[PDB]
Symmetry: C2
Subunit: 224 residues, 2 copies
Protein backbone atom coordinates (compact mmCIF):
# COMPACT_ATOMS: atom_id res chain seq x y z
CA UNK A 1 0.00 0.00 0.00
CA UNK A 2 1.71 3.15 -1.30
CA UNK A 3 0.75 6.82 -0.73
CA UNK A 4 1.47 9.51 -3.34
CA UNK A 5 2.53 13.13 -3.82
CA UNK A 6 1.35 15.54 -6.53
CA UNK A 7 2.47 19.02 -7.54
CA UNK A 8 1.18 21.39 -10.25
CA UNK A 9 2.84 24.25 -12.03
CA UNK A 10 0.12 26.68 -13.23
CA UNK A 11 -0.67 30.01 -14.87
CA UNK A 12 -3.39 30.95 -12.38
CA UNK A 13 -4.80 30.26 -8.97
CA UNK A 14 -8.29 28.74 -8.76
CA UNK A 15 -9.61 25.26 -9.56
CA UNK A 16 -9.79 26.26 -13.26
CA UNK A 17 -6.17 27.40 -13.43
CA UNK A 18 -4.32 26.69 -16.68
CA UNK A 19 -1.82 23.95 -15.78
CA UNK A 20 1.82 23.82 -16.95
CA UNK A 21 2.86 20.46 -15.54
CA UNK A 22 1.88 17.85 -12.96
CA UNK A 23 4.44 15.71 -11.14
CA UNK A 24 3.41 12.65 -9.12
CA UNK A 25 5.32 10.00 -7.14
CA UNK A 26 4.11 6.99 -5.17
CA UNK A 27 6.03 6.27 -1.97
CA UNK A 28 6.07 4.09 1.10
CA UNK A 29 4.60 5.64 4.27
CA UNK A 30 6.29 3.06 6.56
CA UNK A 31 8.45 5.12 8.96
CA UNK A 32 11.16 2.43 9.05
CA UNK A 33 11.34 2.37 5.22
CA UNK A 34 13.51 5.26 4.01
CA UNK A 35 13.10 5.47 0.23
CA UNK A 36 16.07 7.38 -1.18
CA UNK A 37 16.21 10.30 -3.60
CA UNK A 38 17.27 8.29 -6.66
CA UNK A 39 14.56 5.63 -6.43
CA UNK A 40 11.89 8.24 -5.66
CA UNK A 41 12.93 10.28 -8.71
CA UNK A 42 12.94 7.08 -10.80
CA UNK A 43 9.48 6.00 -9.66
CA UNK A 44 8.13 9.44 -10.48
CA UNK A 45 6.53 10.86 -13.60
CA UNK A 46 6.05 14.38 -14.93
CA UNK A 47 2.94 15.16 -16.99
CA UNK A 48 3.49 18.28 -19.11
CA UNK A 49 0.56 20.17 -20.60
CA UNK A 50 0.01 22.03 -23.83
CA UNK A 51 -0.74 25.55 -22.62
CA UNK A 52 -2.06 27.01 -25.88
CA UNK A 53 -4.94 24.51 -26.10
CA UNK A 54 -6.15 25.68 -22.69
CA UNK A 55 -6.71 29.21 -24.02
CA UNK A 56 -10.45 29.70 -23.83
CA UNK A 57 -10.83 26.68 -21.53
CA UNK A 58 -8.73 27.45 -18.44
CA UNK A 59 -7.68 30.50 -16.48
CA UNK A 60 -4.50 32.50 -17.19
CA UNK A 61 -4.22 34.91 -14.25
CA UNK A 62 -2.19 37.99 -15.09
CA UNK A 63 -0.57 38.29 -11.65
CA UNK A 64 0.75 34.77 -12.34
CA UNK A 65 1.83 35.44 -15.92
CA UNK A 66 3.87 38.37 -14.64
CA UNK A 67 5.23 36.27 -11.77
CA UNK A 68 6.57 33.72 -14.31
CA UNK A 69 8.04 36.52 -16.46
CA UNK A 70 10.28 37.56 -13.53
CA UNK A 71 11.56 34.09 -12.66
CA UNK A 72 14.97 32.66 -13.46
CA UNK A 73 15.91 31.53 -16.98
CA UNK A 74 16.10 27.89 -15.88
CA UNK A 75 12.72 28.03 -14.13
CA UNK A 76 11.18 29.68 -17.19
CA UNK A 77 12.78 27.01 -19.39
CA UNK A 78 11.19 24.08 -17.49
CA UNK A 79 7.79 25.64 -18.30
CA UNK A 80 8.37 26.44 -21.97
CA UNK A 81 6.27 24.53 -24.54
CA UNK A 82 7.85 21.36 -25.88
CA UNK A 83 6.85 18.37 -27.98
CA UNK A 84 6.02 16.34 -24.88
CA UNK A 85 3.09 18.64 -24.05
CA UNK A 86 -0.27 16.87 -23.96
CA UNK A 87 -3.83 18.10 -23.86
CA UNK A 88 -5.25 18.19 -20.35
CA UNK A 89 -7.68 15.31 -21.04
CA UNK A 90 -4.66 13.21 -22.11
CA UNK A 91 -2.72 14.30 -19.04
CA UNK A 92 -5.39 13.29 -16.55
CA UNK A 93 -5.64 9.91 -18.31
CA UNK A 94 -1.87 9.46 -17.88
CA UNK A 95 -2.31 10.49 -14.23
CA UNK A 96 -4.98 7.85 -13.59
CA UNK A 97 -2.88 5.17 -15.33
CA UNK A 98 0.05 5.88 -13.03
CA UNK A 99 -2.13 5.57 -9.92
CA UNK A 100 -3.69 2.29 -11.11
CA UNK A 101 -0.19 0.89 -11.79
CA UNK A 102 1.50 1.90 -8.51
CA UNK A 103 -0.14 0.07 -5.59
CA UNK A 104 -2.52 2.84 -4.52
CA UNK A 105 -5.54 1.73 -2.52
CA UNK A 106 -8.61 3.87 -3.42
CA UNK A 107 -9.88 3.59 0.16
CA UNK A 108 -6.72 3.56 2.30
CA UNK A 109 -3.95 5.44 0.50
CA UNK A 110 -3.34 9.14 1.19
CA UNK A 111 -2.62 11.89 -1.35
CA UNK A 112 -0.24 14.73 -0.46
CA UNK A 113 0.55 18.17 -1.86
CA UNK A 114 2.22 21.38 -0.66
CA UNK A 115 -1.01 23.23 0.03
CA UNK A 116 -4.13 21.06 -0.23
CA UNK A 117 -6.28 23.99 -1.32
CA UNK A 118 -4.14 24.45 -4.42
CA UNK A 119 -3.31 21.11 -6.15
CA UNK A 120 -6.23 18.88 -5.20
CA UNK A 121 -8.97 21.29 -6.41
CA UNK A 122 -7.24 21.53 -9.79
CA UNK A 123 -6.68 17.75 -9.89
CA UNK A 124 -10.35 17.16 -9.17
CA UNK A 125 -11.40 19.74 -11.74
CA UNK A 126 -9.37 17.85 -14.32
CA UNK A 127 -10.91 14.53 -13.29
CA UNK A 128 -14.35 16.15 -13.67
CA UNK A 129 -13.44 16.90 -17.29
CA UNK A 130 -13.47 13.10 -17.66
CA UNK A 131 -17.15 13.15 -16.78
CA UNK A 132 -17.83 16.38 -18.71
CA UNK A 133 -16.45 14.71 -21.83
CA UNK A 134 -19.04 11.97 -21.24
CA UNK A 135 -21.84 14.55 -21.32
CA UNK A 136 -22.40 14.84 -17.55
CA UNK A 137 -23.95 18.14 -16.45
CA UNK A 138 -21.94 20.23 -13.99
CA UNK A 139 -24.58 19.82 -11.27
CA UNK A 140 -24.55 16.02 -11.75
CA UNK A 141 -20.77 15.61 -11.62
CA UNK A 142 -19.78 12.87 -9.15
CA UNK A 143 -16.10 11.85 -9.26
CA UNK A 144 -16.04 9.86 -6.00
CA UNK A 145 -14.96 6.69 -7.86
CA UNK A 146 -12.56 8.36 -10.32
CA UNK A 147 -10.43 10.15 -7.70
CA UNK A 148 -7.03 8.71 -6.68
CA UNK A 149 -7.77 8.88 -2.93
CA UNK A 150 -10.84 9.41 -0.83
CA UNK A 151 -11.30 13.11 -0.21
CA UNK A 152 -10.96 12.65 3.56
CA UNK A 153 -7.55 11.10 2.84
CA UNK A 154 -5.98 14.10 1.15
CA UNK A 155 -3.21 15.44 3.37
CA UNK A 156 -1.37 18.77 3.56
CA UNK A 157 2.44 18.76 3.52
CA UNK A 158 2.94 22.07 5.37
CA UNK A 159 0.63 20.94 8.17
CA UNK A 160 2.30 17.52 8.45
CA UNK A 161 5.91 18.74 8.77
CA UNK A 162 5.05 21.67 11.05
CA UNK A 163 3.11 19.35 13.36
CA UNK A 164 5.74 16.61 13.34
CA UNK A 165 8.52 19.01 14.41
CA UNK A 166 6.35 21.08 16.81
CA UNK A 167 7.77 24.38 15.42
CA UNK A 168 5.15 26.83 14.14
CA UNK A 169 5.78 28.07 10.58
CA UNK A 170 8.44 25.40 9.92
CA UNK A 171 7.30 23.60 6.77
CA UNK A 172 10.65 22.15 5.68
CA UNK A 173 12.80 19.53 7.41
CA UNK A 174 16.61 19.14 7.47
CA UNK A 175 17.91 15.94 5.87
CA UNK A 176 21.25 14.25 6.68
CA UNK A 177 24.31 15.40 4.72
CA UNK A 178 24.20 14.52 1.03
CA UNK A 179 20.61 13.23 1.06
CA UNK A 180 19.78 15.48 -1.92
CA UNK A 181 22.85 14.77 -4.06
CA UNK A 182 21.77 15.06 -7.69
CA UNK A 183 19.07 17.68 -7.12
CA UNK A 184 18.21 19.93 -10.09
CA UNK A 185 16.54 23.07 -8.80
CA UNK A 186 13.59 23.34 -11.21
CA UNK A 187 12.95 19.67 -11.93
CA UNK A 188 9.32 19.05 -11.02
CA UNK A 189 9.99 15.42 -10.08
CA UNK A 190 12.92 16.31 -7.82
CA UNK A 191 10.84 18.89 -5.92
CA UNK A 192 8.31 16.19 -5.05
CA UNK A 193 11.14 13.84 -4.13
CA UNK A 194 12.63 16.33 -1.65
CA UNK A 195 9.18 16.90 -0.11
CA UNK A 196 8.69 13.13 0.26
CA UNK A 197 12.06 12.82 2.00
CA UNK A 198 11.39 15.80 4.27
CA UNK A 199 8.09 14.27 5.41
CA UNK A 200 9.64 10.86 6.11
CA UNK A 201 12.53 12.24 8.16
CA UNK A 202 10.13 14.47 10.08
CA UNK A 203 8.21 11.28 10.87
CA UNK A 204 11.36 9.46 12.03
CA UNK A 205 12.50 12.29 14.31
CA UNK A 206 9.10 12.75 15.96
CA UNK A 207 8.99 8.99 16.60
CA UNK A 208 12.67 8.73 17.56
CA UNK A 209 14.13 6.55 14.81
CA UNK A 210 17.01 9.01 14.14
CA UNK A 211 18.02 12.46 15.35
CA UNK A 212 17.91 15.84 13.64
CA UNK A 213 21.38 16.58 12.17
CA UNK A 214 23.19 19.85 12.80
CA UNK A 215 23.25 22.88 10.52
CA UNK A 216 26.84 21.96 9.60
CA UNK A 217 25.85 18.26 9.56
CA UNK A 218 22.99 18.19 7.02
CA UNK A 219 22.56 18.65 3.27
CA UNK A 220 22.23 22.45 2.87
CA UNK A 221 19.52 22.04 0.21
CA UNK A 222 17.16 20.94 3.00
CA UNK A 223 17.67 24.21 4.90
CA UNK A 224 14.94 26.94 4.43
CA UNK B 1 -2.64 37.14 17.96
CA UNK B 2 -5.33 34.53 17.31
CA UNK B 3 -5.75 31.77 14.74
CA UNK B 4 -9.16 30.88 13.26
CA UNK B 5 -11.25 27.92 12.11
CA UNK B 6 -13.93 27.90 9.39
CA UNK B 7 -16.50 25.39 8.21
CA UNK B 8 -19.14 25.59 5.50
CA UNK B 9 -22.24 23.53 5.12
CA UNK B 10 -22.93 23.30 1.38
CA UNK B 11 -25.21 21.89 -1.30
CA UNK B 12 -22.30 21.24 -3.65
CA UNK B 13 -18.75 20.09 -4.13
CA UNK B 14 -16.41 22.44 -5.98
CA UNK B 15 -15.24 26.00 -5.27
CA UNK B 16 -18.51 27.31 -6.78
CA UNK B 17 -20.59 25.21 -4.40
CA UNK B 18 -23.89 26.56 -3.10
CA UNK B 19 -23.27 27.49 0.56
CA UNK B 20 -25.69 26.87 3.42
CA UNK B 21 -23.83 28.43 6.32
CA UNK B 22 -20.33 29.42 7.44
CA UNK B 23 -19.11 29.10 11.04
CA UNK B 24 -15.89 30.83 12.08
CA UNK B 25 -14.14 31.02 15.46
CA UNK B 26 -11.01 32.98 16.35
CA UNK B 27 -8.93 31.19 18.94
CA UNK B 28 -5.63 31.14 20.79
CA UNK B 29 -2.90 28.96 19.23
CA UNK B 30 -0.82 28.93 22.41
CA UNK B 31 -0.60 25.41 23.89
CA UNK B 32 -0.59 26.48 27.54
CA UNK B 33 -3.95 28.23 27.17
CA UNK B 34 -6.83 25.75 27.10
CA UNK B 35 -9.88 27.83 26.24
CA UNK B 36 -13.18 26.27 27.30
CA UNK B 37 -15.97 25.05 25.05
CA UNK B 38 -18.29 27.73 26.40
CA UNK B 39 -15.98 30.64 25.58
CA UNK B 40 -15.16 29.26 22.13
CA UNK B 41 -18.84 28.98 21.27
CA UNK B 42 -19.53 32.44 22.70
CA UNK B 43 -16.73 33.89 20.56
CA UNK B 44 -17.94 32.12 17.41
CA UNK B 45 -20.32 33.41 14.78
CA UNK B 46 -22.48 31.69 12.18
CA UNK B 47 -23.34 33.22 8.82
CA UNK B 48 -26.40 31.56 7.25
CA UNK B 49 -26.79 31.97 3.51
CA UNK B 50 -29.92 32.53 1.44
CA UNK B 51 -30.02 29.42 -0.79
CA UNK B 52 -32.61 30.73 -3.25
CA UNK B 53 -30.45 33.70 -4.26
CA UNK B 54 -27.71 31.31 -5.46
CA UNK B 55 -29.85 29.47 -8.04
CA UNK B 56 -28.19 30.22 -11.35
CA UNK B 57 -25.01 31.43 -9.60
CA UNK B 58 -23.64 28.65 -7.37
CA UNK B 59 -23.54 24.91 -7.87
CA UNK B 60 -26.22 22.56 -6.46
CA UNK B 61 -24.77 19.04 -6.75
CA UNK B 62 -27.27 16.19 -7.20
CA UNK B 63 -25.33 13.83 -4.93
CA UNK B 64 -24.99 16.49 -2.20
CA UNK B 65 -28.74 17.19 -2.40
CA UNK B 66 -29.40 13.44 -2.13
CA UNK B 67 -26.98 13.12 0.81
CA UNK B 68 -28.89 15.90 2.59
CA UNK B 69 -32.18 14.14 1.79
CA UNK B 70 -31.05 11.25 4.04
CA UNK B 71 -29.85 13.13 7.10
CA UNK B 72 -31.86 13.19 10.34
CA UNK B 73 -34.61 15.84 10.64
CA UNK B 74 -32.42 17.54 13.25
CA UNK B 75 -29.62 17.99 10.70
CA UNK B 76 -32.05 19.16 8.01
CA UNK B 77 -33.55 21.89 10.22
CA UNK B 78 -30.27 23.82 9.85
CA UNK B 79 -30.83 23.72 6.06
CA UNK B 80 -34.31 25.29 5.88
CA UNK B 81 -34.67 28.99 4.96
CA UNK B 82 -34.56 31.43 7.84
CA UNK B 83 -35.00 35.15 8.55
CA UNK B 84 -31.27 35.44 9.32
CA UNK B 85 -30.38 34.38 5.74
CA UNK B 86 -27.97 36.73 3.91
CA UNK B 87 -26.77 37.10 0.34
CA UNK B 88 -23.32 35.63 -0.32
CA UNK B 89 -21.69 39.09 -0.71
CA UNK B 90 -23.33 40.09 2.54
CA UNK B 91 -21.98 37.04 4.33
CA UNK B 92 -18.44 37.42 3.01
CA UNK B 93 -18.51 41.02 4.25
CA UNK B 94 -19.64 39.75 7.65
CA UNK B 95 -16.84 37.16 7.56
CA UNK B 96 -14.29 39.88 6.79
CA UNK B 97 -15.69 42.04 9.63
CA UNK B 98 -15.40 39.15 12.09
CA UNK B 99 -11.77 38.54 11.04
CA UNK B 100 -10.95 42.24 11.38
CA UNK B 101 -12.45 42.45 14.89
CA UNK B 102 -10.65 39.42 16.35
CA UNK B 103 -6.88 39.88 16.52
CA UNK B 104 -5.96 38.04 13.33
CA UNK B 105 -2.58 39.00 11.86
CA UNK B 106 -2.70 38.83 8.04
CA UNK B 107 0.93 37.71 7.75
CA UNK B 108 1.21 35.36 10.76
CA UNK B 109 -2.18 33.91 11.71
CA UNK B 110 -3.16 30.43 10.53
CA UNK B 111 -6.56 29.42 9.15
CA UNK B 112 -7.98 25.97 9.86
CA UNK B 113 -10.67 23.71 8.34
CA UNK B 114 -11.50 19.99 8.23
CA UNK B 115 -10.40 19.39 4.68
CA UNK B 116 -8.26 22.18 3.30
CA UNK B 117 -9.33 21.55 -0.31
CA UNK B 118 -12.99 22.02 0.58
CA UNK B 119 -13.60 25.19 2.63
CA UNK B 120 -10.72 27.40 1.63
CA UNK B 121 -11.47 27.27 -2.14
CA UNK B 122 -15.09 28.20 -1.41
CA UNK B 123 -13.99 31.00 0.91
CA UNK B 124 -11.59 32.30 -1.74
CA UNK B 125 -14.23 32.07 -4.41
CA UNK B 126 -16.56 34.14 -2.20
CA UNK B 127 -13.83 36.72 -1.63
CA UNK B 128 -13.14 36.76 -5.40
CA UNK B 129 -16.79 37.79 -5.73
CA UNK B 130 -15.83 41.07 -4.01
CA UNK B 131 -13.46 41.77 -6.88
CA UNK B 132 -15.98 40.75 -9.54
CA UNK B 133 -18.48 43.04 -7.80
CA UNK B 134 -15.93 45.82 -8.58
CA UNK B 135 -15.97 44.86 -12.28
CA UNK B 136 -12.66 42.98 -12.24
CA UNK B 137 -12.24 40.45 -15.07
CA UNK B 138 -11.74 36.79 -14.11
CA UNK B 139 -8.22 36.77 -15.54
CA UNK B 140 -7.21 39.79 -13.42
CA UNK B 141 -8.64 38.76 -10.06
CA UNK B 142 -6.14 39.06 -7.19
CA UNK B 143 -7.45 38.52 -3.64
CA UNK B 144 -4.07 38.29 -1.92
CA UNK B 145 -4.66 41.34 0.30
CA UNK B 146 -8.28 40.36 0.98
CA UNK B 147 -7.71 36.86 2.24
CA UNK B 148 -7.93 36.32 6.03
CA UNK B 149 -4.61 34.50 6.09
CA UNK B 150 -1.89 34.10 3.52
CA UNK B 151 -2.39 31.02 1.37
CA UNK B 152 0.75 29.35 2.73
CA UNK B 153 -0.73 29.78 6.24
CA UNK B 154 -3.76 27.58 5.53
CA UNK B 155 -3.68 24.44 7.68
CA UNK B 156 -5.58 21.14 7.59
CA UNK B 157 -7.22 19.76 10.71
CA UNK B 158 -7.17 16.10 9.62
CA UNK B 159 -3.44 16.26 8.89
CA UNK B 160 -2.71 18.07 12.17
CA UNK B 161 -4.53 15.80 14.63
CA UNK B 162 -3.20 12.68 12.86
CA UNK B 163 0.33 14.09 12.98
CA UNK B 164 0.25 15.07 16.66
CA UNK B 165 -1.08 11.67 17.82
CA UNK B 166 1.01 9.54 15.39
CA UNK B 167 -1.84 7.18 14.42
CA UNK B 168 -2.63 6.79 10.71
CA UNK B 169 -6.24 7.82 9.95
CA UNK B 170 -6.96 9.13 13.47
CA UNK B 171 -8.48 12.59 12.90
CA UNK B 172 -10.21 13.05 16.25
CA UNK B 173 -8.71 13.40 19.70
CA UNK B 174 -10.07 12.21 23.06
CA UNK B 175 -10.95 14.95 25.51
CA UNK B 176 -10.99 14.92 29.33
CA UNK B 177 -14.37 14.44 31.00
CA UNK B 178 -16.84 17.30 30.70
CA UNK B 179 -14.79 19.07 28.01
CA UNK B 180 -17.76 18.93 25.60
CA UNK B 181 -20.38 19.53 28.30
CA UNK B 182 -23.17 21.48 26.65
CA UNK B 183 -22.54 20.15 23.14
CA UNK B 184 -25.60 20.38 20.87
CA UNK B 185 -25.65 18.07 17.85
CA UNK B 186 -25.68 19.84 14.45
CA UNK B 187 -24.73 23.29 15.76
CA UNK B 188 -22.22 24.76 13.28
CA UNK B 189 -20.45 26.76 16.02
CA UNK B 190 -20.35 23.79 18.39
CA UNK B 191 -18.62 21.68 15.72
CA UNK B 192 -15.84 24.24 15.25
CA UNK B 193 -15.28 24.56 19.01
CA UNK B 194 -14.98 20.76 19.23
CA UNK B 195 -12.34 20.81 16.49
CA UNK B 196 -10.41 23.67 18.14
CA UNK B 197 -10.48 21.71 21.40
CA UNK B 198 -9.44 18.45 19.73
CA UNK B 199 -6.53 20.21 18.03
CA UNK B 200 -5.39 21.88 21.26
CA UNK B 201 -5.43 18.73 23.38
CA UNK B 202 -3.72 16.73 20.62
CA UNK B 203 -0.97 19.36 20.77
CA UNK B 204 -0.83 19.00 24.55
CA UNK B 205 -0.67 15.20 24.38
CA UNK B 206 2.20 15.56 21.91
CA UNK B 207 4.09 18.12 24.03
CA UNK B 208 3.67 16.12 27.27
CA UNK B 209 1.68 18.96 28.89
CA UNK B 210 -0.97 16.37 29.81
CA UNK B 211 -1.57 12.68 29.28
CA UNK B 212 -4.43 11.51 27.10
CA UNK B 213 -7.53 10.35 29.03
CA UNK B 214 -8.34 6.65 28.84
CA UNK B 215 -11.03 5.56 26.38
CA UNK B 216 -13.27 4.95 29.41
CA UNK B 217 -12.27 8.19 31.20
CA UNK B 218 -12.79 10.63 28.29
CA UNK B 219 -15.76 12.69 27.14
CA UNK B 220 -17.71 10.18 25.00
CA UNK B 221 -18.59 12.94 22.52
CA UNK B 222 -14.91 12.77 21.47
CA UNK B 223 -14.79 9.07 20.55
CA UNK B 224 -14.88 7.68 16.99
Amino acid sequence: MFDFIIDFETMGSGEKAAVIDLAVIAFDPNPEVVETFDELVSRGIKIKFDLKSQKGHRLFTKSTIEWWKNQSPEARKNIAPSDEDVATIAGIAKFNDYINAHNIDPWKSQGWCRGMSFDFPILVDLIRDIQRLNGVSENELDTFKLEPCKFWNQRDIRTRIEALLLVRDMTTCPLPKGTLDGFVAHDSIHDCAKDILMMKYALRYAMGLEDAPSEEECDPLSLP
